[PDB]
Amino acid sequence: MRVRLSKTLAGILRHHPGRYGVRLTREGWARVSEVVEGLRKAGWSWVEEWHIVGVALHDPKGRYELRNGEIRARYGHSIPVNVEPLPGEPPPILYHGTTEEALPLIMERGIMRGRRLKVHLTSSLEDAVSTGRRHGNLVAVLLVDVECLRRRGLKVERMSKTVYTVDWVPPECIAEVRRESLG
Ligand SMILES: [Cl-]
Ligand SMILES: [Cl-]
Ligand SMILES: [Cl-]
Numbered sequence: 001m002r003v004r005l006s007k008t009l010a011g012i013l014r015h016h017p018g019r020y021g022v023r024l025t026r027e028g029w030a031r032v033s034e035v036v037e038g039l040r041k042a043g044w045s046w047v048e049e050w051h052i053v054g055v056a057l058h059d060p061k062g063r064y065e066l067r068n069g070e071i072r073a074r075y076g077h078s079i080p081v082n083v084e085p086l087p088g089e090p091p092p093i094l095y096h097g098t099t100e101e102a103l104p105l106i107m108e109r110g111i112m113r114g115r116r117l118k119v120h121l122t123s124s125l126e127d128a129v130s131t132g133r134r135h136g137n138l139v140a141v142l143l144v145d146v147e148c149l150r151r152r153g154l155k156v157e158r159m160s161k162t163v164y165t166v167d168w169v170p171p172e173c174i175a176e177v178r179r180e181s182l183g
């Protein structure tokens, strides 16, 4: 964390900009120079703007967006911001990675947001597993019926090539559960 630049940047842009001296607009935008200065004040003496540009442009998932001198995270916020969705229709199945410990409550009342503003879904099975493992448990992957969501009046918004958001996933819209412990 304190050694991982992209992980630290995601935290600044999604959860806690103020303690790095970073101001965000209500669309999530930060000045890259202000991000670099905030990281340097926090002890990252070697960080330069070309690092932050590369964290964004070489990110494998499209976590970040640049615009002349500014940067934002496209999704994952716990800070209230508005990010406009990308064009594109979601595929019929999306994945959500979680823990086996969370399954009984998910089965009762669905997937609900944690600290983030929205529930996040991915078209990449690999990424769903990686995300579940961050919750540090036996990983469970939920296969989510996207048109079930839309039939329930939930908008499914594309925030990056592979990541989509929704307010809530009703338990009826969970098509399949795959448990790590049974692989
Ligand atoms: Cl968001
Ligand atoms: Cl708005
Ligand atoms: Cl926007």
Ligand SMILES: [Cl-]
Pocket (backbone or CB within 6 Å): 114, 116, 118, 119, 120, 121
């Ligand atoms: Cl999420």
